[model samples]
Target chain A: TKIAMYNVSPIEVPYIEDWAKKNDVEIKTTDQALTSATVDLAEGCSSVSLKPLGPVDEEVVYQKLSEYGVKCIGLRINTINFDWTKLLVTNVPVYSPRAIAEMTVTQAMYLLRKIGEFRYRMDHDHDFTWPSNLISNEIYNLTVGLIGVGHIGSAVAEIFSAMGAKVIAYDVAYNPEFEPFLTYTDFDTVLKEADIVSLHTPLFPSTENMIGEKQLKEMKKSAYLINCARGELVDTGALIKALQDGEIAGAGLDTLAGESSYFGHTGLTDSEIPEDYKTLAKMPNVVITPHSAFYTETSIRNMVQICLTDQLTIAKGPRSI
Target chain B: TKIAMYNVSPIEVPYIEDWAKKNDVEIKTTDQALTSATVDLAEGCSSVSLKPLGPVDEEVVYQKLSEYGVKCIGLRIVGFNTINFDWTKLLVTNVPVYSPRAIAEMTVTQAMYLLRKIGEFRYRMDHDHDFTWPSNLISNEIYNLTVGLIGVGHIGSAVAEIFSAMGAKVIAYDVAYNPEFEPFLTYTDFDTVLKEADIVSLHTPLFPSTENMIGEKQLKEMKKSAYLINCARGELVDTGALIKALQDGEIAGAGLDTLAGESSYFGHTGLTDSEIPEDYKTLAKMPNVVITPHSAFYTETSIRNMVQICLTDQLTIAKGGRPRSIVN
Candidate 1:
C-alpha cells in the first residue's frame, strides 16, 4: 500500500520514512506543500497523512479523494474543531493527553512563583536583597478550577489534587465519571472561588470567547489564569485588561488569539509580536511559552504510535494494534 | 539616685533617657569621658549604665566606683565581650540573652539555603530558556549528616540540640560548661572533623584573629568539602581570601560570616571610608555572601520583649518603677 505524507516539515519526514521502512511500506514526501498543492499531491495515493496547517473541509476532502480514489485519511495531530462526519473517509487522530497536561502543570507552577522574575535579576548581577516580606503562597493550599474536565483537564486535575489542591470542575453536561476526584461546580462559582483557573474546553460556537470581560470580572483578584487548550477560548483583550487592572494575579498562556500568524513571522522575538501580546510579555508576572507544551519527545512518539495503530486497524478490518 | 550612662551613641540614648525620666532619676551622658575620665563621670552616682562599646573591665570599674561609691553596673547589650572579671571591684554585668535564639534559627536557614544555591538561579532574567544547568548543587535534603558547631553556650547549644533532633551528628566545640544534650557529640580533634564535616557553623568566641581563622588553610582542609556558615562572627575570616575560595568553589559555599563591619559602612554607598575594615563591603556583593542587615536578632516578639525586660530590670534595681532585665 502506498502512503503519501503532505506538508510534513523537512525535519519530521525522516522519522516517518524510518517507520515506513520498518513496516515494509512504500512512502513518498512532497516539498513543503501549501494548502493548494496538498490536494494535488494526494491525487494518486490510496492513503494520505496530513498535518494540521491547511483547511480540510468537505469540499477539499471530496475533491482530493474522488480524483485519487483514496479511502483512508489520517491526521498528524488531534483536534475537535473540524467535523469528521462530513468527510466520508476513515479518520485517525494522534492522542497524547497525559504529556500535554503535565506541561500545563509545570507552566502554572513556574508562573505563580515568580521564578522568571527573580531569575532575570540574578542573571544581570543584581544583589540578593529580598524585595518585601511577602512570602510566596504555597501550591498545596489552593483550589484549581478546570473549565472542561476532558482528557487533558482530567489529567491536570489529578496532579493538582495530589499536590493537596482541591480540584473543582465545570462542564456544560456534567460527566458522572469525574465525580470521585473533581467536585462539579457551576461555571460562575468555579470562577469566583478558584485560586487558579485553567481552560481545557474545545472551541465550539458557544465556547468561543467564553471567558470574556464578565467571566474575568467574576474571578478572584489573587487567582492565576492558565490557558493551554486554545486561544479563542479566552478573549485576549479581556484577559489583558484583567491583568492590567489587577483583577487577577497573572496568566500563563501556551496559545493566544491570532498566534498562528504571530508565530509564523515573528518567532520568539519580543519586538515583532502583536502589541497586546508584547504588552503581556512585558509584565513580570505573565509567562508565555511558545506553544511548545505538546512538542515533547514522549508526546511525539505517542503521536506516531497512535497514527500507525489506526492505519493497521483499517488495513486489517478492525484488528487491534 | 544619679544614673551614669557611658559610651552611649546618640541614637540609643533616647530609649534609656526615657526610662530614666519615668523613674525620677537624673540622666548623665558620658560620651565626652575617656577611659581615664570614668571616676569623674561616676562621682556621686549610685548606679552606672554601660552600652555595648563601653569598656567595663576591672580597671574602669574600680577607678569609677571606688571614688564615687557606685554599687551596680548595667550592661545595655546582650554580650559580655568587654567585661574583665579579675580585678577586685564590686560589679554586676547584665547581658540580655532574650530572643537571640530565634535570630540564630533564621540565620542558619538563610545560610543553608543560599549555600546550596537554591535561590541564586531564580535571579536570572532568561532562566526560563534552556541553557547549561548551573554546576552548584541546590539544597540537598537535610535528612542526615554531621553538623559541627563551634561554641555551645546559650543560643548555640539550643541550635545544636535542634540540629541533633533532625538526625544530624551534632559535634560542638566549647571551652567551658559541657552541658549534656541528647545525641550530643563532642570531638576531641577539631582538625579531623574540620576536614570531614558536611556542615560547619560558628556561634561566638573571644580572639583577635577569630575573624581570619577560617582562611585558606582551614578552607583547604575541608573535604573540598562541606558548606561553612558564620552567622556568629564576620571577622572570623579574611574577606579577600574567602571570596577567592567561593569563586573557585574551593569550599562548597559560605554564608555571610557576619556583617563584621556592617554597622559603620557596609550599607551606605559613595564617599569611600579612609580605613575600610577587612574589605567586607566588596565581599557582601558575592553570590554566596547572603548579606543580611545584621538582622538575625530582629524578630518581632524578641525585640519588644528585650526592650521591656531590660527597662524593668533597671527600674526595680534603681528603686524606681519596676525591675526589668536586671543582672545579679
Candidate 2:
C-alpha cells in the first residue's frame, strides 16, 4: 500500500523514507503544498499520513481521500484542539500521547538550572568567580504541582516523584488510578503551594487561560511555572508579568501563544514581544527554549513506531498486531 | 615588660601593633637590622620573638638572652628545622599545630582532584571543545590506593583519617609517637612504601637539601609511577628535576613540589604572568603543581585565632601569670 506523507521537511524526509522502506510500504512526499498538490498526490494512495499542520477538515479530507481511494487518515500527533467535527468525516487514527511528560521535565530542569546561561558564560571568557546568586533551587526539595492527571501528566508525576520531588496534582474529575502517589488538591492550593507548577491539562473552552493573572498572583515568589501541553492553556502575558514583578521566579514554555503564526518567521525578532514578554526575557531568572522539547530522539522514534503500527493495523486488520 | 619582634615587614607591623594594644602589652619594633640589634633590643625584655631568617643557634640564644634577662625564645612557626638547638641554652616555644589539619586536607583535596588541570580548563574559553588528552591518569574515584604520608603528627593523622574515609590505606611514617587512627598502615620503612604508594604526600621536615630530596634518583625509584604531593615542606622535593619528570610523565602527576628560594615573590599578570622567580615562573605555569600562594592556612577564623591566641600567651607571660604555652 502506498502512504502519502505531507508537510515533510528536508531533515525529516530521510527518517520517513527509512520507516516506509522498513515496513515494505511505498511512500510519497510533497513539499507542504496542502491545497492542489495534496489532492493530486492523494489520488492513488491507500492512506495518507500528515505531520502537524492546519486542521484536516471534513471537506478537504473527504475530497482528497474520495479521489485517492484512501480509507484511513493518520495524524502524527494527538492534539484534538482542532475542529474534530470536521476531522471526524475521515477515519482518523491519532498517535496516543507522545513523550510530552519527558519533554516537560527536561524543559523545567533546563530553565531551573540555567544550563544555557552557564554554558554561554563558560564558553565565553567571562569571569571565573563561582556565582552564588545563580545557585539553582535543588529539585529534591521542590514540590511539583501537576494540573492534569492524564497519560502525560501521570508520566510526569511518576518521573518527578522518582527524582524525590513531592508531586501534587489537581484534576477536574478525580481518577482512582492516580491516588497513592499524587496528593489530590484543588486549583488554588496547587497554584499557591507548589514550588514548581506545570500545566499538563488538555486545551478546552473551560481550560483556556485557566492559569490567568488572578491565579498567578497567588503563587509563591520562588515558584517556577512550566507549560508543555498547550500555550493557550496559560495566559502568557500574566506569566510574564508575574516573572517581571517577582511574583514568581521564572517560567519554561514548550509552546507559546501565537507560536504557529510567529514560528519560522522573523516576527519573534522584528515584532515587539508583548511588554510583559520583553520584561520576562530581560530578567536574568527567566529562561526561554525554542519549542524543541518534544524533539528528542526517543520521542521521535516512539512517534514513528506508533504511527506505523496504527497504519498497519488499519490496513491489515487486528491480525497485523 | 617590652616584647621585641624582629625582621617584621612594614605591612605586618600594624597588625602586630594592633595585637599588642588589644592585649595591653607594649611592642618595641626595630628597623631592618642585624642579629646584634635584635640581641640589644632583647636586653631587659621578658621574651624575644623573631621571624625565620638566620638559624637561632645555642651560642646566639645564650649570649643574647643571658645578658638581656630574657627567659624565653618563642619561634613563631611550628617547624623547628631551622632552630639550632642546644637545649640547655634557651627555652623554645613554637606554635605547633594551629591549622595544619586544614592545610593538609586542602592540599590533599587539591592534589587528588588534579585542581591545576581543572582550574586551567575552567579558565579557558570553549572549555568543552578543548580536547587536551589526559597527560596523567585522570582520577575520577579516590578508592583503594596506598597514600604514603611522611608525618603522622596532628595534621598528618587528620589527613590520614580523611583519606581513610575515602577508602585509602594510609601508610604513614612519623618520628614521634603515633596517634590511633583506623586504616593507618604504619610504615617504619619509608623507601619501601615510597616505591609502592600510588600517591606519596610529604608532611615531614625541611632541612638543607630536603628541598631536592625527591630528585632524579627518587623520581626514578618511584615505580616509574606514583604521583608526589609536597604540601608540608617547600624544600622537600627537587623543583628542577621534578619539572623534567612531569614533562616526561615519569611519575604521573605532582602537586605543589614547593620551590625553596621563590616563596616570597609570586604574582600574576593578565594572561601572561611576570616578575616571578625563574623556577617558580616555570613550575607555577605547569599543568601539575597547584601553586597556591602559601595560603592553605588562611581561613578567616583560623587567622583570627592564630593572632589572638599568640597575643594572649605573650600577655600572660609578661604579667608573670605562668604562661600556659611558655617554653622552658
Candidate 3:
C-alpha cells in the first residue's frame, strides 16, 4: 500500500521511514499545503496522511481525492465537529496537552527563581548575581493553583505536589483521582491564595477572556501567572495592565495571541507590534518561548504512530469523544 | 554601657540603633579595621564588636584593651578560629543563633539550575531569542537525583531539609555528630559520598583536616557523572585538583561560590580578569562551573541576621550577663 503525506517537513521523514519499514508500505511526502487544488496530486493512493491542524473539506476529499482513487484520509487535528463518514477517516490524538504539562514545570521553576534576571546579569556583566533576600519562594514550600484540572492541569498538579508544593485548583469538574495531590478550591480562593496560578482550561464562551481586570486584581501582588494554554483565555489588555501595575509579579507565557500577524512576515520597514506583547516581551519578569510545548521525542513519536496506523483500520479506528 | 564597633560600614548603622534601643545601651561605630594600634579606640567601652572576619593581634589587643578598660569582645560569624582570644582576661562571644535557611535556599537554587543547564539555555535564548533545548540536552527533576552534602553543619542541615522535602535522597559525611540529619539524610562516609552522589556539595569549613580534603584521590573516586559544588571554603577542594578533574572529565563540573584566592575576597574591585589566578580564570569561563566570587553569604536576610545576632550578643555581654554564644 502507498500513502501520501501532505504539508510534510524533513523532521517527520525519519518517522515516516520507520513506519514504512515496519509496515512494508511505501510512503511519499510532499510540500503541498493540502488545499482543494493540491489534493489532486494524491492520485492512485490507498491513504493520505495530514499534518497537524491542517484544514480538510468535502470538495477536496470527495471531488479530487475520490476521483484520484484514494481510499482513506488520516487527520491530525482540530476537526472533530465535522461530518466525514462518507470516506474512511482516522484521526490521531493531539499530544499537546501532555507536553504542555512538562514545559509548565520548567517555566514554573524558572520564574520562581527569576532566572531571567539572573541570566541578564550573566550576559551583561558576568556577575554571579544571587538575588538573595529578594524573597523568591522556592517551589518547596509554595502553593500552586490550577485553573483547569484536565490533562495538563492534573499533570502539573502531580509535579507540583510531588515536588512538595501545596497544590490547589479551581475547576468546574473534579476527578476523584486528583485527591491528596491537589485540593479543589473556588476560583477566588485560588487567586487570592496561591503563589503561582497556571492556566489549562480550554478556551470557550466561559473561559475566553475570563482572566481580566477583576481576576488580575484578586491575585496576590507577589503571585505569578502562567499561561501555556489558549492565549484567548486571558484578555491581553488586562494582563498587560496587571503586569504594568505590578498587580502580579511576573508571567511565563509559551502561547500568546496574534503571533501569526508578524512572526515570519515580510521584512519590516515599519510595523505595529501590539502594545501588550511589545512590553511583555521586553519585560525581564516575563518569559515568552517560541510555541512548541507539544514537541517531545516520546509524544511526537506516538503522534506519528497514530498517524501511521490510521490506514490499517481506517474505517474502524479513531474513537469519538 | 558604651560599646564600640570596628571594621563597620554605614549600612549597619540601623542595626546598632535597633540593638541599642532594645538593650538600653549606648554604642558608637568606626570604619577602623580591628588591629593592635587602634585598640585604644575601644577604650572606656564595656564591649567591642569586631568584623565578621579580619586580622587582629592577640597580645597587644589583650594588654592595651584591658589596660584601657575594655570588658568584652563580640563576633558575628559561626567560626571564631581567626584570633587568639584571651578568655581568662576578657569575655569573647559570637552570634550562632542565625538559621541556615538562606544558604540552604542558595545551594538548592544553584544546584537545581546547574542540573537543568539553565545558564546555557539562557545564554542561547538571549543571543537568538528562541526556545530550543540544545541538541542532546534535557533536564532531570530534583526527585531523580541523589545529592550528598559534606559536613552537615548549619548550612548542610537546612540543605538536607530542603532537598529531602523536595523528595531527593539526601546523604552526607560528617565527623562532628549531627543527629538532626538522621531522618532527612543518610549519614555516610567520605568514599560513599564521593562515589554515589550525582551532585556532591561542600559545606564544610577549612580546618587543617578539611583543607584539600577533596583532592585528586577523591576526584578520581567520584563517578564521571558526579558534579562538585563548593559554596563554603574553596580550600576544602584543592583548586588545582578540581581544575584537573574538570579538564580530564573525572567529574562533570563544579559550582564554586568561593575560590582559593584574594580575588574571591574582592568582587569587581578593579582586579583585571587576568589578576584572577590562571586556574580560577579558566574554571570561571566554564558553562557547567559557576564561580560567584564569595557571594553565598552575602544575602540581605543573612547579612541583617548576622549583624542583629552579633549586636545582641554584644549587648548581653556588656550588661554583665554571659553571652548565649560565648566561646571562652
Candidate 4:
C-alpha cells in the first residue's frame, strides 16, 4: 500500500524518506500543496498526508477518495474535519511548545534591550553613538504579561520567571502547576502593568483583533508587545497607529495581518506591500520577522516526525486523532 | 565641609542632591573629567569623588589635590591603576560591585541573538530583502547547550546563575573559585572550557597578565562550531586575532559588546565610515558578528546603582569612617 505526502519541504524530505524506508512502504511526495485538483495524485494510495491551503471539502473530495480505495487521511496540523463513516483521520496534536516559547523570550529581550534600535543605527545609518535615551531596562526588573497560559504560554511564563522577571498571566482556564511561576491575574491588569505583553492565545472569532486601539492605549508608554502566536490577534491598523502615535513603545512581531502575501518571498517593491505593514517595518523600534518563531530544528523535526508517525500508525491499521 | 563630584551626569544629579541634603554637606559638581588641567574644579572641597580620564599622578594631580586640603578620594568605578599615591597620606575607595546582573543579562542577550542567527536574518532582510528562511539557520535550543565562563567573579557568577536557571550546563574557570556558586556551575581548566563549551564567554578583568588572553593559539584550541562572547573587556581578547579567527573559521561567530579602539568612536557619531577602524568595519560587515558599543553596563538600574553607591561611600568617608569598598 502506498501513501501520498503533499507540501513536502526540503527539510521534511529527509524525514519522509527515512520514515518511508523504515516502514518499507511506497510514498508519493509533492512540493505543491494539497488541493481538489491535486487529489488525483493520491488516487491509488491507501492513505494520504497533507496540509491543505484550500478547504478539503468533504462533499467535493471525500467521495472521490472513498471510490479510489483510500481508507485514511493524515493531517499535519492539529485540526481535522473528515467524514468518519467514509474515511479515518489522524492529526498531529502537539509540536514543540518550547521552541515557540524560547522565540517569544528572544523577541521580548530583543525589544527590552533596544537591540533593534542600536543595531539599525549602527548598521544602516552608520551611527554608533551611545545615546542616553537609548539606555535599556534589564529583564531582572521587567514584568512580563502572558495573554494565554496554554502549553506554549506556560513555557514562556516559566522562562521569564526563571530569568528574574515577574510573570503575570491572564488565562480563563489557568493551571495550578504554573501558579509557582506566574500569578494569574485579570486581563486588564496584564495590559496595564506589564512592561512586555506577549500574545499566545489561539486565534478565534472572540480573540481576533484582541489588541486594538483601546487595549493599546491601556498599556504603558514604555511597554512592548510580542506576538508569536497568530497575526489576527492584533489589529494591523490599530497596532500601526499605536506605534506611530507612541501609545506603546514598540513591537516584536513574528506574525502580521495579511502576512501571507509578503512573507517568504522577495522582490516586492514598497508599493506592493500594505501601508500598515510598511509603516511598522520602517520603524526602528519595531522588529518584523517572517513567521519563523516556530522554525527551529527541534520543532521542525517534531512536526514532521509526529505527523509522519500518525500516518505510519494508521497505515499499519489504527484509528488516530 | 564639601565634596567635589566630577563627571556628574544628569541621572546622578537627583541622587547627588538627595545625599547632599541628607548629610548637610556643600557639594561642588562638574560635567568634566578629573585631570591635572581640571583639578582646580575641586580646589575648595574637602573630599573628591571622580572618575579620572587621565593619570592622577603623584607629582601633578595628586599634589594639587593634597594641597587643596582634599583628605579623601572616592572613585566611582572599580579599577584604580591610574592613581599613584601614598596610601598613608590619603584615603581612597571604589564602587566594586554596583550591578553585575545588568552586564550579565546583556551578555546572555547577545549570545542568544547570535545562537538564534538573528543577526544574519536581520542583515539579509535589510540588505537583500530576502525573507526566505536560510537553510543553515536552524538553531539549537539553549537548554541543549553548554556555556563556558572564563571568570567567576561577581559578573561571571551572575551569568552562571542565569544560564543555570535556563537549564544550560555551565562550566567555569577562575583563579579563585566561590563555593557558593557550586551547584550552578562546574570548575574546569581553561583549555577544557574552550574546547567543550558551545559558547565561551569572558568575564575576567583585564590585567597585564590577562591582556590578549584569547589570541590565535587560544582561538585555534576552541571548537569550530563554538562562539566567543566578550562582554567583560575588549583588551582581554586580541581584536586582530579575533578578526582573523572569525575570517578563517577558527570558531563559529562572536558576540562582542566591547572592542579595542572603541573609545575613539563609541559616544560620537560624527566620524565617517572611513574613520572607523578597519578591524571594526570588517567585523561589523560580518552577519555572524553581533557588536554593541560597550553598552552592556548602560542600563537604568546599573547606572542608578553606580551613582548611589559612589555618593553613599563618599558620604561615609566624609563622616570620618572607613568606607566599606575601600580599595587601598
Per-residue lDDT of A292-321 in model 4, one digit per residue for the tens? 988877766666677666666665664355
Tens-digit lDDT track for model 3 on A1-321?
677887666776787789889978777778666776667667767777777444455354556666776777776545422454355666665555668898888887888888776777788789885755344765756789999878789888878776767788998886877764688989999999999999988888867888999988899988889998877888888988998898998888887777656543466543455656777888777888766666776666666667777675552344612
Off by over 4 Å in 1: A34-44, A56-69, A78-94, A120-127, A266-272, A316-321, B1-328
Ranked candidates (lDDT, high to low):
4, 3, 1, 2
Better of 1 and 3 by DockQ: 3
* Highest lDDT against the true fold, candidate: 4
**What does candidate 4's lDDT look like per residue over B62-164, in tens digits?**
7788888787788877867767756325778877887899899988999998999988889889999999987777788776689999988889989988887
Q: List runs of model 2 lying over 4 Å from the truth.
A: A56-61, A78-98, A114-136, A266-269, A272-276, A318-321, B1-328
For candidate 2, write residues A135-221 as lDDT tens digits: 887675678898886887887877776554668889987886665446789888898789888888888898888887887788888
DockQ values for all predictions? 0.01, 0.01, 0.03, 0.06
Computed on C-alpha atoms, the DockQ of candidate 4 is 0.06
Docking class for model 2 is incorrect
What stretches of model 4 exceed 4 Å from their correct place? Answer: A1-321, B36-38, B58-61, B86-89, B272-274
Write down the lDDT of every candidate, Cα atoms only. 0.66, 0.66, 0.76, 0.83
Arrange candidates by TM-score, descending.
Answer: 4, 3, 1, 2
Per-residue lDDT tens digits of candidate 1, residues A1-321? 666766576556657776777776666767554354456666555566666565554355455564675556666673212354333233333356777788789878987776766766566657465566224666756789989868888888767755546678898777765554568888888998898999999899889998888988889988889999889998999999998898888898898878987765543565656798888888777888778778776666555545655654554453221
Model 1, B219-296: lDDT tens per residue? 777755577777777677666677778777777666663655555754445546564554665655555556665666
Find the candidate with the highest TM-score and give its number.
Answer: 4
Off by over 4 Å in 3: A1-321, B58-60, B86-88, B122-131, B262-268
The CA root-mean-square deviation of candidate 4, after full C-alpha superposition on the true structure, stands at 23.8
Give per-residue CA lDDT, model 3, range B120-168, as digits (tens).
6776677779687766347777766889988888899888888876667
